[PDB]
Symmetry: C6
Subunit: 160 residues, 6 copies
């Protein structure tokens, strides 16, 4: 299973990962986008992209009150970075890195469902800009060329 | 499993916990907030507001039940409620998450039973003017690591507390 | 498991319970209330309570046609009493007693789902007034003080 | 399991029951009613009306199927239908719940199949002007206890029957 | 389990059935109707029948592109016939036969859910007229009298 | 299980299939169309229109992901995409269903992960001006039976292609 971490501003989480120490451990995440343009109209049906907030699941931890305060105050962070690393430890390839710029905590949903040794919560992030870098790998796990990159300035509706 | 308790005003529940005796045993709880602000506007614009949800919890039907029903019906508020979450293992284990509510209304009670059930359960929701959340980080050995990390918000006045 | 019974007016059910003989056996029940008041407004956000109908599940039995007639005619009963008793028999503590006054049968939903040796149905009750008495117990099962009581006149919106 | 049968007009189904041969075998059924009256008004006010639902039942696709489809399509009503529920054990066991409908329209037929299925099933709903419900209580030994307990309602005229 | 086949116009499917060769194999089907008339009104509450489209499930097969073209062009077939036969082979009684006249392919919903050796799709048919013939059988499986028949002209709202 | 692949423009995925290397491995897909015409009108009337849905498919997150995200964001279309479904058993088995899309927009990308998951997955939808569907029937032994059966539709112009 892949290892997943998120760094939001200078907020410290409780990750004990060797290279992502004191970031937030990510248990799950989801994100998406859609385009309203249409190919059924012809003549040269232009639309726009809608980019969703990014959702992730974490343990309740020392970041929790800070994220709650960010959500309430509406104060944004300069950057948030979600790192997805291939299973096996800190020498493994960080093959998917999503970087968000101008980051608002749009929701926090917390609780204890019962019978749980570690409580979890869902956080959502709203942001002006997104970068996604994917690192292809060779058969042996080594890097295969440079990363494949996508960058989009949502606020200004142009590529980054 | 973590141990979870809620104290509502001076209402007595049936917890037999050494620390939280006569509080209410919490079986499950949920709470949340959201922010309508947007980063897609820019220029200093797109400001929003926080919406803080009621706190929901599940309890056994117990001696606090009729009192909670009266509070819900009358609309009378309690000065404070406090939800305590404690690491498994007993009364000297760390109470690592404590949520304190001020000016508290019982916004709903949903009760009943089935089975099979030897102990009936019910759901309660709480509406409140202010909230404090205190999280206590711990070292690898379980000892306290620094002081609590704190969040306080006055919902009524829409400012930090 | 707790034993549960309901007595609606003078309607006879088929309970074979030693002390709740010829009441209706209750298989499940649900009930609730909500308050529209708000603590976010200050200045001294007053609202009102909404009390739900009480729902219960029973076997189809000799009360069934009488409850159907009550529902259709819209004729109310003076009282209905739901008794919840700790497991073990008729000497055990009746620890939750809900008494409803001016009682309308608001719905009856019946049928046979197939493969059933005993058919069941759901009934709902609408009422002007409610009393809820909870009897706390000591460690050995004996009563612990008097009952804890809640009474509300819905029709007139005041405590009972 | 109780044995369940429905007779609709003079339509023939494929039941092989000793008593209810050529009726329709009922696999499941549901029915209900509700009252819009309210006890929260008082003073003699807050009167309501009953709403009686159609009766739904499940049957095997059988020789009655095309006839039920024709009735549904034409809107032609049957004088009577009768649902009989009988305690398990055979034809001399007590028919403890009998529901008789008068002036009966087939309000829907939903049919089909899948699997796996050796016998296909379908759902039928019935709309009617009047209903009688007869319940027969029994002693501990299964013998009849007194006479049937009765409920009759004329939906069309909104009065007892 | 019953054997099920459908013949739509002259469209060839891939059935290997001895008597329904090159029809479409049917994996499931559903159909229905409802009547808006009411018995609660008296005085002599007349309504109308609504007949649903017939839905069936099939394997993706050589009929698939033809059905897709019919759906897109909106061109109707003279007839479609759904045959349901008692388990055991081609000598067994075809006990339910549904014949549709003036047949439009109203939808095709296809795909592969993953892990499937044979892909399936759902088709719906809209039609002006329907015939349903049910063949009752004796205890030994032999025919019991003639078929029981239902015919309805939806387009003109009269029996067929 | 059938083998499923999609080629979108000249975008490279991570398939290691002998034939479809550098295409995208398809884990699941769905597509559909519907016709609003009605046979209940008659007289030559009740004509309708086809509505062709976007094509949805599931893929592993791979090197095509950022490119698909850029296409979705920019609204830039690809000349062609091709979904190939091949009978189980390898590269010389029959590619019995081939769907070719022309003028292709990436209408959505929904991505993420959980578990537990060693390989993360995502859903993609495609909007297109024209579609071709080629189905290749086979004999009992798996050899090709005649030529492909074909369907082509120009959605933009609402006519066959």
């Amino acid at each position: 299973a892949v290892d997943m971490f998120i760094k939001i501003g200078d907020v410290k989480g409780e990750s004990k990962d060797k290279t992502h120490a004191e970031e937030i451990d990510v248990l799950a995440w989801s994100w998406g986008m859609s385009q309203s343009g249409s190919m059924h109209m012809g003549g040269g049906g232009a639309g726009k992209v809608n980019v969703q907030d990014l959702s992730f699941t974490k343990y309740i931890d020392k970041s929790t009150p800070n994220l709650m305060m960010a959500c309430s105050s509406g104060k944004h962070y300069p950057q948030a970075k979600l790192t997805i690393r291939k299973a096996g430890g800190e020498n493994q390839v960080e093959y998917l890195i999503i970087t968000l710029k101008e980051v608002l905590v749009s929701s926090v949903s917390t609780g204890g469902s019962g019978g749980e040794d570690r409580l979890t919560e869902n956080v959502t992030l709203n942001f002006a800009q997104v970068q996604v870098d994917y690192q292809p790998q060779k058969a042996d796990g080594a890097k295969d060329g440079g990363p494949v990159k996508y960058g989009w300035n949502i606020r200004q509706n142009v590529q980054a």
